Design an enzyme around this catalytic site. Sequence first.
Site, PDB file in Angstrom:
ATOM      1  CB  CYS A 105      -0.872  -0.033   1.273  1.00 24.85           C
ATOM      2  SG  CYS A 105      -1.932   1.709   1.204  1.00 24.85           S
ATOM      3  NE  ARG A 108       2.550   0.799   3.484  1.00 27.16           N
ATOM      4  CZ  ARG A 108       3.476   0.142   3.731  1.00 27.16           C
ATOM      5  NH1 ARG A 108       3.802  -0.294   4.870  1.00 27.16           N
ATOM      6  NH2 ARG A 108       4.448  -0.080   2.683  1.00 27.16           N
ATOM      7  CD1 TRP A 277      -7.101   9.115  -1.995  1.00 27.16           C
ATOM      8  CD2 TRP A 277      -8.225   9.225  -0.135  1.00 27.16           C
ATOM      9  NE1 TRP A 277      -6.161   9.646  -1.237  1.00 27.16           N
ATOM     10  CE2 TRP A 277      -6.821   9.769   0.057  1.00 27.16           C
ATOM     11  CE3 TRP A 277      -9.037   9.431   0.940  1.00 27.16           C
ATOM     12  CZ2 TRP A 277      -6.634  10.493   1.099  1.00 27.16           C
ATOM     13  CZ3 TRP A 277      -8.683  10.139   2.257  1.00 27.16           C
ATOM     14  CH2 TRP A 277      -7.379  10.373   2.408  1.00 27.16           C
ATOM     15  CD  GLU A 282      -5.417   2.143  -6.734  1.00 29.83           C
ATOM     16  OE1 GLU A 282      -5.852   1.002  -6.338  1.00 29.83           O
ATOM     17  OE2 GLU A 282      -5.616   3.070  -6.428  1.00 29.83           O
TER      18      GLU A 282
HETATM   19  C1  HEM Z   1      -6.442   6.624   1.775  1.00 27.22           C
HETATM   20  C2  HEM Z   1      -6.018   6.435   0.473  1.00 27.22           C
HETATM   21  C3  HEM Z   1      -5.347   5.072  -0.143  1.00 27.22           C
HETATM   22  C4  HEM Z   1      -4.528   4.805  -1.215  1.00 27.22           C
HETATM   23  C5  HEM Z   1      -4.243   6.287  -2.072  1.00 27.22           C
HETATM   24  C6  HEM Z   1      -4.031   3.721  -1.482  1.00 27.22           C
HETATM   25  C7  HEM Z   1      -3.401   3.107  -2.304  1.00 27.22           C
HETATM   26  C8  HEM Z   1      -3.035   1.862  -2.469  1.00 27.22           C
HETATM   27  C9  HEM Z   1      -2.720   1.458  -3.817  1.00 27.22           C
HETATM   28  C10 HEM Z   1      -2.450   1.912  -4.987  1.00 27.22           C
HETATM   29  C11 HEM Z   1      -2.526   0.087  -3.555  1.00 27.22           C
HETATM   30  C12 HEM Z   1      -2.189  -0.943  -4.849  1.00 27.22           C
HETATM   31  C13 HEM Z   1      -3.595  -1.541  -5.341  1.00 27.22           C
HETATM   32  C14 HEM Z   1      -3.333  -2.474  -6.558  1.00 27.22           C
HETATM   33  O1  HEM Z   1      -2.247  -2.362  -7.190  1.00 27.22           O
HETATM   34  O2  HEM Z   1      -4.182  -3.215  -6.760  1.00 27.22           O
HETATM   35  C15 HEM Z   1      -2.709  -0.573  -2.321  1.00 27.22           C
HETATM   36  C16 HEM Z   1      -2.797  -1.542  -1.740  1.00 27.22           C
HETATM   37  C17 HEM Z   1      -3.452  -1.941  -0.471  1.00 27.22           C
HETATM   38  N1  HEM Z   1      -3.902  -0.997   0.401  1.00 27.22           N
HETATM   39 FE1  HEM Z   1      -4.013   1.104   0.226  1.00 27.22          FE
HETATM   40  N2  HEM Z   1      -4.582   3.067  -0.326  1.00 27.22           N
HETATM   41  C18 HEM Z   1      -5.387   3.777   0.593  1.00 27.22           C
HETATM   42  C19 HEM Z   1      -6.181   3.384   1.596  1.00 27.22           C
HETATM   43  C20 HEM Z   1      -6.142   2.056   2.294  1.00 27.22           C
HETATM   44  C21 HEM Z   1      -6.553   1.705   3.378  1.00 27.22           C
HETATM   45  C22 HEM Z   1      -7.643   2.536   4.190  1.00 27.22           C
HETATM   46  C23 HEM Z   1      -6.262   0.520   3.712  1.00 27.22           C
HETATM   47  C24 HEM Z   1      -6.895  -0.409   4.821  1.00 27.22           C
HETATM   48  C25 HEM Z   1      -7.339   0.055   6.067  1.00 27.22           C
HETATM   49  C26 HEM Z   1      -5.475  -0.096   2.620  1.00 27.22           C
HETATM   50  C27 HEM Z   1      -4.828  -1.290   2.679  1.00 27.22           C
HETATM   51  C28 HEM Z   1      -4.343  -1.782   1.493  1.00 27.22           C
HETATM   52  C29 HEM Z   1      -4.053  -2.938   1.168  1.00 27.22           C
HETATM   53  C30 HEM Z   1      -4.233  -4.246   2.406  1.00 27.22           C
HETATM   54  C31 HEM Z   1      -3.417  -3.290   0.037  1.00 27.22           C
HETATM   55  C32 HEM Z   1      -2.824  -4.593  -0.654  1.00 27.22           C
HETATM   56  C33 HEM Z   1      -3.877  -5.065  -1.328  1.00 27.22           C
HETATM   57  C34 HEM Z   1      -3.339  -6.076  -2.268  1.00 27.22           C
HETATM   58  O3  HEM Z   1      -2.155  -6.318  -2.297  1.00 27.22           O
HETATM   59  O4  HEM Z   1      -4.098  -7.252  -2.720  1.00 27.22           O
HETATM   60  N3  HEM Z   1      -5.285   1.077   1.698  1.00 27.22           N
HETATM   61  N4  HEM Z   1      -3.219   0.764  -1.683  1.00 27.22           N
HETATM   62  C1  LIG Z   2      -8.217   0.743   0.090  1.00 27.29           C
HETATM   63  C2  LIG Z   2      -7.637   0.642  -1.468  1.00 27.29           C
HETATM   64  C3  LIG Z   2      -7.377   1.886  -1.889  1.00 27.29           C
HETATM   65  C4  LIG Z   2      -6.921   1.825  -3.370  1.00 27.29           C
HETATM   66  N1  LIG Z   2      -6.459   3.007  -3.680  1.00 27.29           N
HETATM   67  N2  LIG Z   2      -6.646   0.736  -3.781  1.00 27.29           N
HETATM   68  C5  LIG Z   2      -7.094  -0.223  -3.245  1.00 27.29           C
HETATM   69  C6  LIG Z   2      -7.221  -1.774  -3.880  1.00 27.29           C
HETATM   70  C7  LIG Z   2      -6.395  -3.079  -3.721  1.00 27.29           C
HETATM   71  C8  LIG Z   2      -6.291  -4.045  -4.524  1.00 27.29           C
HETATM   72  C9  LIG Z   2      -5.602  -5.377  -4.240  1.00 27.29           C
HETATM   73  N3  LIG Z   2      -6.131  -6.204  -5.304  1.00 27.29           N
HETATM   74  C10 LIG Z   2      -5.949  -7.601  -5.264  1.00 27.29           C
HETATM   75  C11 LIG Z   2      -5.119  -7.824  -6.079  1.00 27.29           C
HETATM   76  F1  LIG Z   2      -4.050  -8.292  -6.084  1.00 27.29           F
HETATM   77  F2  LIG Z   2      -5.582  -8.770  -7.064  1.00 27.29           F
HETATM   78  C12 LIG Z   2      -5.260  -6.527  -6.597  1.00 27.29           C
HETATM   79  C13 LIG Z   2      -7.116  -3.809  -5.816  1.00 27.29           C
HETATM   80  C14 LIG Z   2      -7.873  -2.753  -6.062  1.00 27.29           C
HETATM   81  F3  LIG Z   2      -8.310  -2.397  -7.325  1.00 27.29           F
HETATM   82  C15 LIG Z   2      -7.801  -1.419  -5.159  1.00 27.29           C
HETATM   83  F4  LIG Z   2      -8.306  -0.499  -5.480  1.00 27.29           F
HETATM   84  C16 LIG Z   2      -7.731  -0.388  -1.893  1.00 27.29           C
HETATM   85 CL   LIG Z   3      -9.906  -1.043  -8.669  1.00 20.61          CL
END
Ligand code: HEM
Ligand SMILES: Cc1cc(N)nc(-c2cc(CN3CC(F)(F)C3)cc(F)c2F)c1
Ligand SMILES: [Cl-]
Lengths: 401, 401
Positions: A105, A108, A277, A282
């Site tokens: 993420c 953070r 958000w 993305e």
């Molecule tokens: C506040 C604005 C936030 C932004 C701009 C943001 C941004 C991102 C982005 C760009 C990713 C990569 C997602 C992808 O490529 O699919 C990500 C992953 C992730 N975010 Fe954040 N996020 C935000 C809030 C949060 C919140 C509130 C949480 C949890 C309480 C969170 C937990 C996670 C987790 C667990 C992942 C990993 C998901 C995965 O790898 O499957 N994020 N975030």
């Molecule tokens: C809280 C939050 C904010 C943000 N900005 N993005 C995400 C976010 C995370 C994932 C993870 N996914 C599982 C996978 F590995 F397949 C990709 C997928 C998305 F499409 C998202 F938008 C979540």
């Molecule tokens: Cl998405």
Amino acid sequence: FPRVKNWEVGSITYDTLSAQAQQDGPCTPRRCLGSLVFPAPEQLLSQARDFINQYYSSIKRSGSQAHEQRLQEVEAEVAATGTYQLRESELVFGAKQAWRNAPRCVGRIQWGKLQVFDARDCRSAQEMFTYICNHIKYATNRGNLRSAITVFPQRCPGRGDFRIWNSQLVRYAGYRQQDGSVRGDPANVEITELCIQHGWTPGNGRFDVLPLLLQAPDEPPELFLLPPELVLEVPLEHPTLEWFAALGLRWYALPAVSNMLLEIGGLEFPAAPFSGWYMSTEIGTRNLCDPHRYNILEDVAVCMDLDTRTTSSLWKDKAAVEINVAVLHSYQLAKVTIVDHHAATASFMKHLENEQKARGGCPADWAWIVPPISGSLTPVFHQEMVNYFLSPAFRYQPDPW
Amino acid sequence: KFPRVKNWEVGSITYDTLSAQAQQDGPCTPRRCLGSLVFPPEQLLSQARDFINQYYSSIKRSGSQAHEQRLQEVEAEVAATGTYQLRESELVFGAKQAWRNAPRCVGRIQWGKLQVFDARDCRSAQEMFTYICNHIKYATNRGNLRSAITVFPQRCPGRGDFRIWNSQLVRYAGYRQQDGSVRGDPANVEITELCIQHGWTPGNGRFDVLPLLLQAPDEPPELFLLPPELVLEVPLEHPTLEWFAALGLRWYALPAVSNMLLEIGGLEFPAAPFSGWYMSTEIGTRNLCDPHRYNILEDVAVCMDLDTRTTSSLWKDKAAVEINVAVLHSYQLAKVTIVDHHAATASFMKHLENEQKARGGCPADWAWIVPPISGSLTPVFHQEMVNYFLSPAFRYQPDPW
Ligand code: HEM
Ligand SMILES: Cc1cc(N)nc(-c2cc(CN3CC(F)(F)C3)cc(F)c2F)c1
Ligand SMILES: [Cl-]
Ligand code: HEM
Ligand SMILES: Cc1cc(N)nc(-c2cc(CN3CC(F)(F)C3)cc(F)c2F)c1
Ligand SMILES: C[C@H](O)[C@H](O)[C@H]1CNc2nc(N)[nH]c(=O)c2N1
Ligand SMILES: C[C@H](O)[C@H](O)[C@H]1CNc2nc(N)[nH]c(=O)c2N1
Ligand SMILES: [Cl-]
Ligand SMILES: [Gd+3]
Ligand SMILES: [Gd+3]
Ligand SMILES: [Gd+3]
Ligand SMILES: [Zn+2]
């Protein structure tokens, strides 16, 4: 302890926090698998004990009477019931820690600002639906998005799990076509078929919002349509390419992941949707330009009158940049929170700095933190990172079907 | 014990069985991944035995007369001398293998086409210079670049190494100021200060080709002016932005790494410069736009009249794409071989496919294979990869000071 260099500035740090990494990753000295997407009461007690220690450190009460008393209470509860219950303040702390600990993420810097909805008293899929609607409403906030998580009841012996079958609370249907193609989002073909199989009357557009499939313990999943006025969407237009609006593209305001497992002190919450958000890449880069997603890149490039017959014209690069411009412009126009990849990675660098002072390191997955366009134009490209697993944590889990 | 590797664009799955052969342990452990970090007597016989076996299997001649005979000779040489000499064909085979094994090289589709100049009878820095001059003229070939390596004598105990002090055969000077900042290339401030310290009259330009510092065994380095007619360079213009030329930018034709150590069959070659041709992002994105390199991005954006006042205009992304266009356009106009990041990564996917059938996998460093712009627009972004060390190999080595 691993030494970490930033190549833009030349500064060097040591990630001492990685030494505390509890669970193990996929790499060995023989081979690195960092690029892979998807890599007993006594052990519950040691996990719980470590979390309680984390919590009481956070409130400046380490080694205190209340600290030792809580350790004793948890041991007694595990001895008497095979599990234990979090106090409300421990749940809030643990949810924030799980976000803070999430290596992939980039958002953070915000980890301390998280609204935690305690739904651990939820009784049914119907009450689950109502909690989810209020999450979406609170988090969307008419476009001024607010980070939130809703925590449904923990996994416990004697009962099945609460599960949200959808990967996000808002997703567009993907309809396998007559001729084998997909109309709408190809990422969502499976969940779309499951919804139809469970009584949903499908649409046939490219941006049909899916219903929710919600599973209460030991129940089949139950279908719930989202009230349409709760789902805020943004029609996509470009500030100077007026034909872009005629593409009829849209995306939704709220990114709310709903298929991950929240783990706190050994306890497991298989249903705990969280939302923040969007970062614009993305939507503009992955969702719209991946070949296996909406795959609009060549159509945009042709409309732009780029030379798509040769790679060295960089038509792909030019079209992708304008699609990302369209996303940023459209969300700003609609007054829906969004962050561009330059602003997000700059703030992540400040997060790494904060975390070095606070904890001696920060778990981070370089390949996910670096944005999918303009990688080395952002500061995180030039920052070496150490990837490891801390708990509390968000974990992947198998789909319930 | 055989890693599962998925391509997410297509859904295909392979297993990297080649990884089970990795020799030098990498930097990762089950507790933490260090994949993003740039820089992490007679066991000579086991490394030689293994390499000889590699050679004879590659020519379909394992377990045959010449195989056993060659096994005895290396044994006899090491017994009688403590080391051994590579046959000419073995040196060629090993150079191509080290290239083939280079996890960070996206150009390995070319690994079978390599010109090997055998300079193992070299003595004195003057001989090196003529060898280097032969290489540069062969490799440059009036712009029709040809991959080549020149292999200087191997390291032997009790006597100093052959070393090239420059990191590349062609590098631009970096000069400090009455204020710390650097005119020229900041990556080469150190070797500039070394070259000036050894008698070189510095220029005053942003693109002065440095002299060579060539080191014979146990002798101090000797400065060598490179014949200017042998250093092919490309003035940078843009196909439509008429003012881009007036920025006075240039880059050189030949990328020739001259600071890495070649290791074959236990033998070590600290002087073994290798060259191919550029991928355009190396110049247009890293060398020209890295903040700690020429850092030209904002100057180009000002000239393009872009809104540098907000990150969400994507002015950085737009200026970067046009700089990469200028690089590609200028090299093609000069008839100097160059490959764009789209073409290069597509060829690498074909290489992965070839290597899957030929060897059961391919060591690849995802963070280095994915280009520094438009990462997810290239197929390698969506390919999972396994990183590990095979021998023969190109290794990093300390600065010879
Ligand atoms: C506040 C604005 C936030 C932004 C701009 C943001 C941004 C991102 C982005 C760009 C990713 C990569 C997602 C992808 O490529 O699919 C990500 C992953 C992730 N975010 Fe954040 N996020 C935000 C809030 C949060 C919140 C509130 C949480 C949890 C309480 C969170 C937990 C996670 C987790 C667990 C992942 C990993 C998901 C995965 O790898 O499957 N994020 N975030
Ligand atoms: C809280 C939050 C904010 C943000 N900005 N993005 C995400 C976010 C995370 C994932 C993870 N996914 C599982 C996978 F590995 F397949 C990709 C997928 C998305 F499409 C998202 F938008 C979540
Ligand atoms: Cl998405
Ligand atoms: C023929 C065309 C070639 C292309 C297009 C190419 C491309 C590249 C690129 C883009 C990199 C990344 C380096 C960086 O980011 O600075 C790289 C690294 C590397 N290349 Fe190639 N290369 C070519 C030829 C060769 C040859 C002929 C050799 C050796 C005989 C070679 C060996 C290496 C090695 C060892 C690395 C790793 C450098 C490191 O780890 O720091 N390459 N290559
Ligand atoms: C044969 C060849 C072709 C090509 N296209 N590139 C290279 C190449 C490799 C490197 C590695 N270096 C170690 C570091 F991390 F410091 C950067 C650096 C460059 F500048 C290069 F040009 C080499
Ligand atoms: C195979 C590779 O790991 C995969 O394509 C990754 C790379 N980096 C990523 N980074 C982010 N933020 N999101 C992703 O889905 C991915 N996918
Ligand atoms: C910190 C990070 O590893 C470093 O910036 C790497 C990332 N990927 C790279 N990839 C290539 N091809 N070349 C590089 O120099 C780097 N630098
Ligand atoms: Cl270079
Ligand atoms: Gd117009
Ligand atoms: Gd049309
Ligand atoms: Gd003017
Ligand atoms: Zn690793």
